[PDB]
From Swiss-Prot, chain A:
Keywords: Endonuclease, Genetically modified food, Hydrolase, Nuclease, Secreted, Signal. This is Ribonuclease. It is an enzyme of class 3 (hydrolase). It comes from the Bacteria. GO terms for cellular component: extracellular region.
UniProtKB/Swiss-Prot annotation, chain B:
It is found in: Cytoplasm. The keyword Cell inner membrane does not apply. Keywords: Cytoplasm. Inhibitor of the ribonuclease barnase. Forms a one-to-one non-covalent complex. Pfam families: Barstar. Belongs to the barstar family. It comes from the Bacteria. One of its GO terms (cellular component) is cytoplasm. This is Barstar. Its main location: cytoplasm.
Length: 110, 90
Protein backbone atom coordinates (compact mmCIF):
# COMPACT_ATOMS: atom_id res chain seq x y z
CA UNK A 1 0.00 0.00 0.00
CA UNK A 2 1.02 3.59 -0.70
CA UNK A 3 2.90 5.47 2.02
CA UNK A 4 0.72 8.60 2.00
CA UNK A 5 2.93 11.64 2.48
CA UNK A 6 2.15 14.11 -0.28
CA UNK A 7 0.17 17.36 -0.01
CA UNK A 8 -2.80 15.94 -1.98
CA UNK A 9 -2.63 12.45 -0.55
CA UNK A 10 -2.65 13.67 3.06
CA UNK A 11 -5.14 16.50 2.47
CA UNK A 12 -7.65 14.14 0.79
CA UNK A 13 -7.10 11.61 3.57
CA UNK A 14 -7.72 14.21 6.23
CA UNK A 15 -10.96 15.41 4.63
CA UNK A 16 -12.15 11.91 3.86
CA UNK A 17 -11.43 10.16 7.18
CA UNK A 18 -10.98 13.09 9.63
CA UNK A 19 -7.59 11.84 10.83
CA UNK A 20 -4.02 11.47 9.51
CA UNK A 21 -2.89 8.33 7.72
CA UNK A 22 -1.26 5.63 9.86
CA UNK A 23 2.31 6.55 8.91
CA UNK A 24 2.14 9.68 11.12
CA UNK A 25 3.43 9.76 14.68
CA UNK A 26 3.68 12.74 17.02
CA UNK A 27 7.01 14.17 18.17
CA UNK A 28 6.43 12.71 21.65
CA UNK A 29 5.47 9.31 20.24
CA UNK A 30 8.64 9.38 18.08
CA UNK A 31 10.78 10.34 21.08
CA UNK A 32 9.33 7.38 23.06
CA UNK A 33 10.62 5.06 20.29
CA UNK A 34 14.13 6.56 20.49
CA UNK A 35 13.92 9.46 18.03
CA UNK A 36 16.63 12.06 18.67
CA UNK A 37 16.00 14.89 16.22
CA UNK A 38 19.60 16.11 16.02
CA UNK A 39 20.72 12.56 15.08
CA UNK A 40 18.29 12.40 12.15
CA UNK A 41 17.36 8.81 13.06
CA UNK A 42 13.57 8.78 12.73
CA UNK A 43 13.56 6.14 9.95
CA UNK A 44 15.82 3.94 12.11
CA UNK A 45 13.49 3.95 15.18
CA UNK A 46 10.19 4.20 13.30
CA UNK A 47 10.60 2.92 9.75
CA UNK A 48 8.17 4.41 7.24
CA UNK A 49 6.87 7.05 9.68
CA UNK A 50 6.78 10.83 9.44
CA UNK A 51 6.29 13.37 12.20
CA UNK A 52 2.69 14.65 12.28
CA UNK A 53 -0.39 15.45 14.29
CA UNK A 54 0.96 17.92 16.84
CA UNK A 55 -0.86 21.14 17.78
CA UNK A 56 0.10 24.01 15.48
CA UNK A 57 -0.04 27.31 17.36
CA UNK A 58 -0.12 29.60 14.28
CA UNK A 59 2.31 31.91 16.03
CA UNK A 60 2.58 34.49 13.23
CA UNK A 61 -1.24 34.47 12.85
CA UNK A 62 -1.02 33.70 9.11
CA UNK A 63 -3.77 31.09 9.15
CA UNK A 64 -7.30 32.27 9.81
CA UNK A 65 -8.58 31.92 13.35
CA UNK A 66 -12.15 31.39 14.56
CA UNK A 67 -13.87 30.65 17.89
CA UNK A 68 -13.50 26.90 18.46
CA UNK A 69 -10.83 26.41 15.83
CA UNK A 70 -7.47 24.88 16.57
CA UNK A 71 -4.81 23.76 14.11
CA UNK A 72 -2.40 20.83 13.79
CA UNK A 73 0.50 20.16 11.44
CA UNK A 74 2.28 17.21 9.78
CA UNK A 75 5.45 16.76 7.70
CA UNK A 76 5.08 16.27 3.93
CA UNK A 77 7.48 14.69 1.44
CA UNK A 78 9.51 13.11 4.25
CA UNK A 79 10.94 9.63 4.00
CA UNK A 80 14.20 9.43 6.05
CA UNK A 81 17.03 11.44 7.62
CA UNK A 82 16.74 15.04 8.79
CA UNK A 83 13.40 16.85 8.41
CA UNK A 84 12.59 19.03 5.42
CA UNK A 85 10.77 22.40 5.08
CA UNK A 86 7.37 21.11 3.91
CA UNK A 87 4.31 20.92 6.12
CA UNK A 88 0.53 20.50 5.87
CA UNK A 89 -1.61 22.53 8.31
CA UNK A 90 -5.13 21.40 9.15
CA UNK A 91 -7.84 22.77 11.39
CA UNK A 92 -10.44 21.23 13.69
CA UNK A 93 -13.03 22.23 11.06
CA UNK A 94 -10.97 20.62 8.26
CA UNK A 95 -9.55 23.65 6.47
CA UNK A 96 -6.20 22.63 4.93
CA UNK A 97 -3.18 24.80 4.12
CA UNK A 98 0.41 24.01 3.15
CA UNK A 99 3.83 25.61 3.43
CA UNK A 100 6.93 24.63 1.45
CA UNK A 101 9.12 27.44 2.86
CA UNK A 102 9.23 26.58 6.54
CA UNK A 103 6.20 28.60 7.55
CA UNK A 104 7.10 31.82 5.79
CA UNK A 105 4.11 31.58 3.42
CA UNK A 106 0.99 29.40 3.37
CA UNK A 107 -1.26 28.30 0.48
CA UNK A 108 -4.89 27.20 1.09
CA UNK A 109 -5.42 23.80 -0.54
CA UNK A 110 -8.83 22.79 0.83
CA UNK B 1 25.16 20.02 25.70
CA UNK B 2 24.56 22.58 22.95
CA UNK B 3 25.42 26.17 24.01
CA UNK B 4 23.95 29.23 22.28
CA UNK B 5 24.83 32.87 23.07
CA UNK B 6 22.99 36.05 22.04
CA UNK B 7 24.93 39.26 22.69
CA UNK B 8 21.92 41.58 22.94
CA UNK B 9 23.79 44.81 22.19
CA UNK B 10 24.81 43.55 18.73
CA UNK B 11 21.23 42.78 17.65
CA UNK B 12 20.18 45.63 15.36
CA UNK B 13 17.03 44.09 13.86
CA UNK B 14 14.72 41.06 13.96
CA UNK B 15 16.73 39.69 11.04
CA UNK B 16 19.93 39.90 13.08
CA UNK B 17 18.14 38.00 15.88
CA UNK B 18 17.00 35.17 13.57
CA UNK B 19 20.39 34.96 11.80
CA UNK B 20 22.10 34.66 15.22
CA UNK B 21 19.68 31.91 16.24
CA UNK B 22 20.35 30.15 12.93
CA UNK B 23 24.09 30.06 13.69
CA UNK B 24 23.93 29.46 17.45
CA UNK B 25 21.44 26.59 17.25
CA UNK B 26 22.88 25.15 14.01
CA UNK B 27 19.49 25.43 12.32
CA UNK B 28 18.65 24.11 8.88
CA UNK B 29 19.60 26.26 5.89
CA UNK B 30 15.84 26.46 5.04
CA UNK B 31 15.15 28.06 8.45
CA UNK B 32 12.10 30.24 7.99
CA UNK B 33 13.21 33.06 10.36
CA UNK B 34 9.77 33.33 12.03
CA UNK B 35 8.18 32.09 15.27
CA UNK B 36 6.58 28.93 13.84
CA UNK B 37 9.88 28.01 12.21
CA UNK B 38 11.75 28.56 15.49
CA UNK B 39 9.18 26.43 17.35
CA UNK B 40 9.49 23.65 14.75
CA UNK B 41 13.28 23.63 15.07
CA UNK B 42 13.09 23.40 18.90
CA UNK B 43 10.54 20.60 18.52
CA UNK B 44 12.28 18.61 15.84
CA UNK B 45 15.79 19.73 14.93
CA UNK B 46 17.86 21.29 17.69
CA UNK B 47 20.24 19.24 19.83
CA UNK B 48 19.56 18.93 23.60
CA UNK B 49 20.43 19.58 26.31
CA UNK B 50 20.55 23.22 25.28
CA UNK B 51 21.85 26.24 27.21
CA UNK B 52 20.81 29.63 25.83
CA UNK B 53 22.60 32.64 27.32
CA UNK B 54 20.85 35.84 26.26
CA UNK B 55 22.82 38.89 27.42
CA UNK B 56 21.71 42.53 27.23
CA UNK B 57 18.12 41.38 26.71
CA UNK B 58 16.75 44.92 27.16
CA UNK B 59 18.98 46.31 24.37
CA UNK B 60 17.93 43.47 22.02
CA UNK B 61 14.28 44.60 22.53
CA UNK B 62 15.10 48.13 21.32
CA UNK B 63 15.73 47.21 17.69
CA UNK B 64 13.56 44.13 17.27
CA UNK B 65 10.20 45.66 18.18
CA UNK B 66 8.32 42.87 19.99
CA UNK B 67 10.59 40.25 18.44
CA UNK B 68 12.95 39.62 21.37
CA UNK B 69 10.10 38.97 23.81
CA UNK B 70 8.14 36.75 21.38
CA UNK B 71 11.30 34.72 20.60
CA UNK B 72 12.07 34.29 24.31
CA UNK B 73 8.52 33.12 24.92
CA UNK B 74 8.90 30.47 22.19
CA UNK B 75 11.92 29.13 24.06
CA UNK B 76 10.04 29.16 27.39
CA UNK B 77 7.05 27.33 25.90
CA UNK B 78 9.31 24.69 24.43
CA UNK B 79 10.93 24.26 27.87
CA UNK B 80 7.45 24.03 29.42
CA UNK B 81 6.72 21.12 27.04
CA UNK B 82 9.77 19.17 28.25
CA UNK B 83 12.61 20.29 25.96
CA UNK B 84 15.77 20.33 28.07
CA UNK B 85 16.51 24.05 27.74
CA UNK B 86 18.29 26.18 30.35
CA UNK B 87 17.79 29.92 29.80
CA UNK B 88 20.22 32.46 31.26
CA UNK B 89 18.96 36.06 31.09
CA UNK B 90 21.55 38.80 31.61
Amino acid sequence: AQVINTFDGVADYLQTYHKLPDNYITASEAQALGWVASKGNLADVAPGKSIGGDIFSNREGKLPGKSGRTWREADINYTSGFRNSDRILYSSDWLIYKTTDHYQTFTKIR
Amino acid sequence: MKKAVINGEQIRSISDLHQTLKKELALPEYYGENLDALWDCLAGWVEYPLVLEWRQFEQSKQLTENGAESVLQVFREAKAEGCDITIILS
